[PDB]
């Protein structure tokens, strides 16, 4: 399994593939690892399905409740800190998971969160089994002067690469770009597979 959050100009793009497996037994071809968590924010799950899912629901709600009572959307670093508190508070019987939460408030953001509530923001980062491979290509071709369209391609490339060198990852890769203009929008499957073909990639 592999996910990736990438920051650029005035947007943040997040994508993941979706094969869920049990050791070498790839039991589920179409899991979901990308979730909208608020009007202007998304999150990527990676690790044990049980812990991740419950975690997504808590976060999802915790955010909606916050919005209503405060009349304004929770800032990204705030969501990241909240999460950070939850996880660390139970470090000795941790949610075996690794979360990536991207979004845009006053500016774009992307934070990496570990099972101990360690939270750190980067301009891009990957999460999951195939992390290295993507970190390889991103390290090689990412540039903060890219257009949201260039971005969406780089990402697909990044994931398709990890799909090659990592048996744990696989299936249809899916992306969502979140901008202040349009908000959190997930790209149409077709359009994605279209870019794949165009790029001469595979699967």
């Amino acid at each position: 399994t592999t996910t990736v959050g990438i920051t650029l100009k005035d947007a943040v793009i997040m994508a993941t593939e979706r094969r869920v497996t049990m050791e070498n037994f790839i039991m589920h071809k179409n899991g979901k690892k990308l979730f909208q968590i608020d009007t202007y924010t998304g999150m990527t799950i990676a690790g044990l399905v049980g812990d991740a899912q419950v975690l997504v629901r808590y976060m999802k709600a915790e955010l909606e409740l916050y919005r209503l009572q405060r009349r304004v959307n929770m800032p990204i670093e705030a969501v990241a800190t909240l999460l950070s508190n939850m996880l660390n508070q139970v470090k000795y019987m941790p949610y075996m998971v690794q979360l990536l939460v991207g979004g845009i408030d006053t500016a774009p953001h992307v934070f990496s969160i570990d099972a101990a509530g360690g939270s750190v923001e980067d301009i891009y980062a990957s999460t999951g089994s195939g992390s290295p491979f993507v970190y390889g290509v991103l390290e090689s071709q990412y540039s903060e002067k890219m257009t949201v369209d260039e971005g969406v391609d780089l990402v697909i490339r990044a994931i398709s690469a990890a799909k090659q060198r990592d048996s744990a990852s696989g299936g249809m890769i899916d992306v969502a770009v979140i901008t202040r203009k349009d908000g959190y929008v997930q790209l149409p499957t077709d359009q994605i597979e279209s870019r794949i073909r165009k790029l001469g990639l595979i699967l």
Partner: protein, 227 residues
């Protein structure tokens, strides 16, 4: 003799404390709602005083979640705290089951909360009544609740000061599947007649939701359009 303490059935089978509580709600502002075409709408009379109040900030129709709102009448403080309870209570059902399937259930929980203070000795009941409106797995739904914890589902109803009045108007001129535009009208008309012993309707607060999507709060001008 029998009307000084809330604990306790009267010789005629009544909880005087809960009655006294009801009084407090009558003295509350007037609001109503009704199911219509393919949604439901809520409308409250936003009666303002000083130029010094921060207008909209005195929101009477409050959201519980993007698909369910409620409006309250009675001791303001009591209403607020009881609202937040429903809010988190809502969140709770979402996080365990993954989805607030039946709204009826949401109101039942908050109702039971209120029912508890109806019998557990040392504690004053919630002096407030409110109505929940929204669309759930079953469809558009409308409920009301009093300080006694009594809850009922309606086709249309009201609460607060001019309940009896506005309710009678509807009781008479309520039109089953009235399309939104006409429904909001009938409503505002009904709200008018009632509290409108004092002529000016002022600026009503109105919001609505329709099956298939989230709630919509009417903007100042839009409401003024029906006004």
């Amino acid at each position: 003799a029998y009307d000084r303490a809330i604990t306790v059935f009267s010789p005629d089978g009544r909880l005087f404390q809960v009655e006294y509580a009801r009084e407090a709600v009558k003295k509350g502002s007037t609001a109503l709602g009704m199911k219509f075409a393919n949604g439901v709408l809520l409308i409250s009379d936003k009666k303002v005083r000083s130029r010094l109040i921060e207008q909209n900030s005195i929101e009477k129709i409050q959201l519980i979640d993007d698909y369910v709102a409620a409006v309250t009448s009675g001791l303001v403080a009591d209403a607020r705290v009881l609202v937040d309870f429903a809010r988190i209570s809502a969140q709770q059902e979402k996080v365990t089951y993954g989805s607030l399937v039946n709204i009826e259930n949401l109101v039942k929980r908050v109702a039971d909360q209120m029912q508890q203070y109806t019998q557990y000795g040392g504690v004053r009941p919630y002096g407030v009544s409110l109505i929940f409106a929204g669309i759930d797995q079953i469809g558009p739904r409308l409920f009301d609740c009093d300080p006694a914890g009594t809850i009922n589902e309606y086709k249309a109803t009201a609460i607060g000061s001019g309940k009896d009045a506005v309710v009678s108007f509807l009781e008479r001129e309520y039109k089953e599947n009235l399309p939104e535009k006409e429904a909001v009208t009938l409503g505002i008309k009904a709200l008018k007649s009632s509290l409108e012993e004092g002529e000016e309707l002022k600026a009503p607060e109105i919001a609505s939701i329709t099956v298939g999507n989230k709630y919509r709060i009417y903007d100042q001008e839009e409401v003024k359009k029906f006004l």
